[PDB]
Amino acid sequence: AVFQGDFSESVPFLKTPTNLDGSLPGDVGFDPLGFSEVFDIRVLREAELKHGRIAMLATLGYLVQEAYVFPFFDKVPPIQAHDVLVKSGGMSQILLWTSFLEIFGGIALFQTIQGRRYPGDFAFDPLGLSQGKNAEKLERYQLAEIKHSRLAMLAFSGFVHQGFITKQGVLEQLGNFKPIPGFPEATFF
Amino acid sequence: GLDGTYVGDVGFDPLGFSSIIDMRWLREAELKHGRVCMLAATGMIVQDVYQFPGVTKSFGDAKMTTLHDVAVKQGSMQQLLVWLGLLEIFGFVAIVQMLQGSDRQPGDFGFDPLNCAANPDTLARRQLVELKNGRLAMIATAGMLHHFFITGKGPIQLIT
Amino acid sequence: MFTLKIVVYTTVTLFVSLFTFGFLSNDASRNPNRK
Amino acid sequence: EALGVDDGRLLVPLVLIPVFVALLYGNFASTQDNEDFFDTYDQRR
Amino acid sequence: PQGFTSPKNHFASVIGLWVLFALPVWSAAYKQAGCTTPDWFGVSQVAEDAPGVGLLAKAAPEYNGPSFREGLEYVFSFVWKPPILIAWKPRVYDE
Amino acid sequence: DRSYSMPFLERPPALDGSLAGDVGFDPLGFSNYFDLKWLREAELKHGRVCMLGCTGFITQEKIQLPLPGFDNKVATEAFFSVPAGGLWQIFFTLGAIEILSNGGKLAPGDMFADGRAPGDLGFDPLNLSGDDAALRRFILAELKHCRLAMIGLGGMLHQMLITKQGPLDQLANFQPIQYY
Amino acid sequence: ALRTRLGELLRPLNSEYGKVAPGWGTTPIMGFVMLLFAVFLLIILQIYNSSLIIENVDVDWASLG
Numbered sequence: 001a002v003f004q005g006d007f008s009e010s011v012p013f014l015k016t017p018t019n020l021d022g023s024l025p026g027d028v029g030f031d032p033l034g035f036s037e038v039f040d041i042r043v044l045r046e047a048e049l050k051h052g053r054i055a056m057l058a059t060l061g062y063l064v065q066e067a068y069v070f071p072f073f074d075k076v077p078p079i080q081a082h083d084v085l086v087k088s089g090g091m092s093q094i095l096l097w098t099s100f101l102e103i104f105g106g107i108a109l110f111q112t113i114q115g116r117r118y119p120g121d122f123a124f125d126p127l128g129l130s131q132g133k134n135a136e137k138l139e140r141y142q143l144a145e146i147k148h149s150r151l152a153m154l155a156f157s158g159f160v161h162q163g164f165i166t167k168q169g170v171l172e173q174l175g176n177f178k179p180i181p182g183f184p185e186a187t188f189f
Numbered sequence: 190g191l192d193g194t195y196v197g198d199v200g201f202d203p204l205g206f207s208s209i210i211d212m213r214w215l216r217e218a219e220l221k222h223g224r225v226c227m228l229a230a231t232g233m234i235v236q237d238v239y240q241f242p243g244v245t246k247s248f249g250d251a252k253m254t255t256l257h258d259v260a261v262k263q264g265s266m267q268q269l270l271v272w273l274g275l276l277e278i279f280g281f282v283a284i285v286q287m288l289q290g291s292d293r294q295p296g297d298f299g300f301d302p303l304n305c306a307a308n309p310d311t312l313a314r315r316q317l318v319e320l321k322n323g324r325l326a327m328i329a330t331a332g333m334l335h336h337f338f339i340t341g342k343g344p345i346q347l348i349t
Numbered sequence: 350m351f352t353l354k355i356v357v358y359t360t361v362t363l364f365v366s367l368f369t370f371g372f373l374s375n376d377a378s379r380n381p382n383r384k
Numbered sequence: 385e386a387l388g389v390d391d392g393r394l395l396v397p398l399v400l401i402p403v404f405v406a407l408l409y410g411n412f413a414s415t416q417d418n419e420d421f422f423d424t425y426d427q428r429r
Numbered sequence: 430p431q432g433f434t435s436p437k438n439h440f441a442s443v444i445g446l447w448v449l450f451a452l453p454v455w456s457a458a459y460k461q462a463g464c465t466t467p468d469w470f471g472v473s474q475v476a477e478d479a480p481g482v483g484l485l486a487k488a489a490p491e492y493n494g495p496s497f498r499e500g501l502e503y504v505f506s507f508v509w510k511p512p513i514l515i516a517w518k519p520r521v522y523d524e
Numbered sequence: 525d526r527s528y529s530m531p532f533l534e535r536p537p538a539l540d541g542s543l544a545g546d547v548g549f550d551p552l553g554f555s556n557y558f559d560l561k562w563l564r565e566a567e568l569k570h571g572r573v574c575m576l577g578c579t580g581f582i583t584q585e586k587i588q589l590p591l592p593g594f595d596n597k598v599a600t601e602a603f604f605s606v607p608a609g610g611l612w613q614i615f616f617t618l619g620a621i622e623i624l625s626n627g628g629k630l631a632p633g634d635m636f637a638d639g640r641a642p643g644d645l646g647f648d649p650l651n652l653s654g655d656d657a658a659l660r661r662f663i664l665a666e667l668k669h670c671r672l673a674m675i676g677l678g679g680m681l682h683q684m685l686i687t688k689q690g691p692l693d694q695l696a697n698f699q700p701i702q703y704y
Numbered sequence: 705a706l707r708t709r710l711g712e713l714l715r716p717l718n719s720e721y722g723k724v725a726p727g728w729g730t731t732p733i734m735g736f737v738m739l740l741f742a743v744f745l746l747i748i749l750q751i752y753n754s755s756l757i758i759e760n761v762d763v764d765w766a767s768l769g
């Protein structure tokens with residue numbers, strides 16, 4: 001805001017979102033269309049983390065699935081694997097167990113709505129990372145988790161879409177990089 | 190409805206647009222059209238003089254509007270719509286925040302990378318320049334395109 | 350044949366609907382002992 | 385064959401007329417005292 | 430696989446459970462924060478004194494006037510008794 | 525004293541500045557003989573129905589659902605192609621929205637009996653009607669869009685009935701009426 | 705006397721009983737129109753009677769075709 005004004009850190013032009021405060025981790029203040037105003041921030045935070053935690057595993061997997069396949073499973077481009085496993089019924093097994101865990105999760109969301117638990121804490125810290133000795137680290141880690149999650153969700157999105165246009169696997173695209181098919185060759189007119 | 194405070198006010202609103210529409214909107218619009226037209230005019234003139242490295246082969250000689258009809262097939266135009274649209278959604282938030290009471294003045298996105306407006310006085314002179322060049326640019330762009338429609342010729346070519 | 354059928358269907362539906370919604374309009378209250 | 389409806393147009397009378405009348409009945413229905421009566425029949429009308 | 434054992438029906442059931450859970454979770458989130466922000470209000474670039482802008486929002490006039498049947502009769506009198514010919518009107522009693 | 529819209533005539537008495545979209549155009553004076561709240565609810569409902577409808581005629585031509593028979597570009601032609609039962613299912617769903625939205629008070633005398641300023645069926649999911657000044661100006665827009673859409677849909681329907689072509693397509697490849 | 709919607713609708717049409725215009729009113733106009741009507745009746749009578757032959761006219765069955 002070249003003219004002086006009170007304003008949000010991430011975007012100079014817009015005012016700091018109301019009810020958006022530094023307290024949730026990773027708050028650069030960017031909620032340009034308030035969603036936080038329409039729905040509670042804690043319910044939204046639970047979503048950012050859940051999507052992210054799902055995404056972070058997915059980014060690793062799409063890359064790992066390209067390089068390696070468990071021997072019992074066939075090696076196919078990952079998007080194809082979902083079709084193979086869905087016929088196999090492997091995906092139903094992932095769906096059933098993930099749903100069971102989610103039902104416990106849905107109860108915890110209801111508690112998050114009624115005070116009680118902080119968004120996204122399932123108290124899953126089997127290892128001692130951020131243990132009471134390491135309790136200082138939790139604030140820092142929280143920031144990393146949102147940041148890794150925000151990035152992963154963008155990255156997976158990218159890997160899958162880029163892969164559809166290129167028809168080229170992400171590791172392969174890196175090492176051999178080509179324009180979307182036909183562009184060097186094609187003339188629009 | 191027209192008062193001295195807006196920069197560039199010579200008092201010219203014959204059709205009384207100011208009376209029906211918030212000036213803040215009208216101004217944000219005049220600058221936005223102007224900023225786009227200035228770039229458009231520059232581009233149309235640049236395009237005739239130079240082209241990026243592989244461009245001529247894919248598009249050939251099409252220029253001005255014809256290039257757009259050819260460009261859309263490349264998808265160069267789409268990338269431009271998607272990215273420009275993403276900037277615009279923030280721009281819609283900006284107009285909304287400004288229309289809701291807010292600090293931002295119409296047309297201010299906070300882009301001053303070289304700190305050119307740091308002096309308060311110099312900024313005012315620059316603001317008048319920006320509306321005036323922009324008002325000219327829009328007139329020019331329209332002219333170049335109409336000239337194109339009728340002559341089928343790029344503006345530098347028409348001069349040639 | 351279609352036009353006669355559609356006219357007959359219109360008439361029958363109208364009269365049946367009138368009957369049905371008339372007996373739904375608290376018909377038991379329409380007695381001389383109602384207060 | 386479901387109501388003797390071999391032509392879709394036959395369904396425009398079978399629906400619009402019952403709805404329209406119902407609309408006339410809805411005004412009667414909104415005017416009634418619709419709280420419960422512990423009785424054999426409702427004398428409120 | 431058919432019916433309650435079809436994977437497509439499992440996906441549909443999950444989507445339906447999502448839709449059913451959408452109302453409590455997000456309705457509660459809205460109840461906690463429901464755009465109840467002093468900066469939250471609509472904006473229009475039109476001037477508030479432009480023609481057609483009402484003096485008060487959501488006006489509900491009382492209308493102590495003619496009934497609906499009289500209005501329908503007036504609309505019919507448009508086509509059977511219009512004021513067209515009363516403009517031309519010509520200008521004692523026998524014992 | 526004088527209508528703004530029609531300077532020669534007198535301001536319809538009933539119309540005062542309070543209702544929105546009031547430039548005084550009630551020459552035939554329906555306002556005098558019916559409830560403005562009933563009339564406004566209709567001006568809005570026909571428009572809201574033809575804001576969805578007009579957008580519908582344009583969208584259907586460009587994009588059509590995958591299911592069979594949803595493939596006719598012309599809206600008028602499509603009504604016949606789509607399965608009849610589906611069209612009734614839409615009728616009923618809309619019919620339920622009517623009763624629930626109006627709360628079962630669905631008639632000229634009772635719809636507005638409790639509050640319900642005309643057209644307030646409660647759909648303001650993103651509260652945008654909190655500022656009054658904003659609400660007064662948005663309300664003019666809805667009416668001005670509702671009024672244009674009404675005229676537009678009629679034009680598109682009639683022009684399609686002659687051309688057997690969707691609105692955008694007819695403008696391309698326009699042919700005079702005699703050709704059709 | 706029963707009051708009805710149609711009765712009240714048509715009442716002004718049956719309201720000015722015995723209302724008359726002063727003196728001879730529009731009698732000369734009526735007499736002139738009656739004279740024109742008499743001349744017209746004489747013309748058409750003499751055409752059918754064949755006592756009057758308008759040009760382009762043939763009072764005869766053969767004029768049908």
Ligand code: CLA
Nearest residue numbers: 072073085087088089090091092093094095096097098099
């Ligand atoms: C722990 C409980 C459990 C059990 C009994 C099963 C059972 C099954 N799963 Mg698995 N699964 C589970 C949890 C479980 N799942 C979880 C939590 C996930 C992650 C969300 C998955 C993800 C998954 C996928 C992705 C797939 C399966 C598949 C299968 C089926 C094929 C079995 C197979 O490969 O041959 C027999 C198994 C082997 C030869 C592998 C060696 C197993 C060793 C010998 C047993 C070790 C103990 C065992 C893990 C039990 C653990 C619990 C116990 C300690 C109490 C089978 C019905 C597949 C399927 O649908 O079939 C096509 C498939 O593709 N599952």
Ligand code: CLA
Nearest residue numbers: 191195196197198199200201202206207215216218219324
């Ligand atoms: C679209 C470009 C645009 C816009 C939004 C404005 C807006 C404004 N100008 Mg600027 N101006 C422009 C172009 C523009 N001007 C150009 C090209 C010139 C040079 C001729 C000027 C010269 C000028 C002077 C000298 C002054 C202004 C002033 C003003 C302000 C008040 C004038 C008013 O109420 O009318 C608003 C203007 C319009 C509504 C533009 C109407 C253009 C045509 C007639 C519209 C026709 C309908 C259109 C084609 C429909 C299609 C739209 C569709 C694409 C969406 C206002 C902020 C005054 C000021 O600073 O006050 C503070 C002032 O003194 N202007």
Ligand code: CLA
Nearest residue numbers: 403407562565566569570573615618619620622626630631
């Ligand atoms: C089960 C189905 C159902 C039910 C019960 C309702 C219930 C209701 N609707 Mg309906 N509606 C539905 C489905 C339904 N809706 C659907 C699917 C649509 C299409 C999307 C509509 C479109 C609709 C509109 C557009 C309107 C309603 C209105 C109403 C309300 C008043 C009903 C009434 O008195 O009309 C009884 C029926 C009639 C009075 C007949 C209709 C009148 C004709 C068509 C007018 C013709 C004018 C003519 C062509 C112009 C003259 C031309 C000139 C040259 C002479 C009521 C709450 C009205 C309302 O809320 O008013 C305030 C209203 O304006 N509804």
Ligand code: KC2
Nearest residue numbers: 591594606607608609610611612613614615616617618620
């Ligand atoms: C938004 C309005 C709307 C609502 C609220 C709604 C609710 C439900 C529910 C309740 C939750 C069920 C259980 C259900 C089921 C089916 N709907 Mg659906 N439905 C709506 C709209 C349409 C349209 C426009 C069509 C359609 C169809 C079908 C078919 C296919 C039959 C078949 O397989 O041939 C089946 C089984 C198509 C059709 O009936 O074609 C013959 C078709 O065109 N529906 N529908």
Ligand code: KC2
Nearest residue numbers: 183184185186240241242243244245246247248260263265
């Ligand atoms: C960032 C500056 C830059 C821009 C903004 C830009 C825009 C466009 C557009 C946009 C409308 C099209 C459609 C287009 C097309 C092609 N470009 Mg080009 N291009 C740029 C830079 C380079 C470089 C550095 C090279 C290059 C090439 C090619 C080839 C190759 C195959 C061919 O020649 O057939 C094709 C088809 C390579 C080459 O071989 O050039 C002779 C190469 O080294 N470009 N290029």
Ligand SMILES: CC1=C(C#C/C(C)=C/C=C/C(C)=C/C=C/C=C(C)/C=C/C=C(\C)C#CC2=C(C)C[C@@H](O)CC2(C)C)C(C)(C)C[C@H](O)C1
Nearest residue numbers: 026028146147148150151154165180263264265267268271
């Ligand atoms: C924000 C932030 C941080 C960050 C960050 C970062 C690093 C963000 C990075 C974001 C990026 C790179 C986003 C990229 C978007 C690219 C798009 C949408 C491309 C769309 C293509 C289209 C529409 C197309 C097309 C088409 C064309 C052209 C023509 C057609 O023939 C073909 C095709 C279909 C392909 C982090 C987490 C670090 C921390 C922090 O807490 C906050």
Ligand SMILES: CC1=CCCC(C)(C)[C@H]1/C=C/C(C)=C/C=C/C(C)=C/C=C/C=C(C)/C=C/C=C(C)/C=C/C1=C(C)CCCC1(C)C
Nearest residue numbers: 549574599600601603673674675676677678679681682685
């Ligand atoms: C189509 C058919 C097939 C498809 C399905 C189906 C259900 C079987 C059916 C659909 C049917 C339905 C949807 C068809 C019915 C459709 C449409 C919605 C009717 C539109 C009528 C527009 C009229 C003629 C307006 C003229 C505007 C005036 C002149 C503006 C006047 C203005 C005022 C007065 C004064 C100021 C300015 C001016 C401009 C002078």
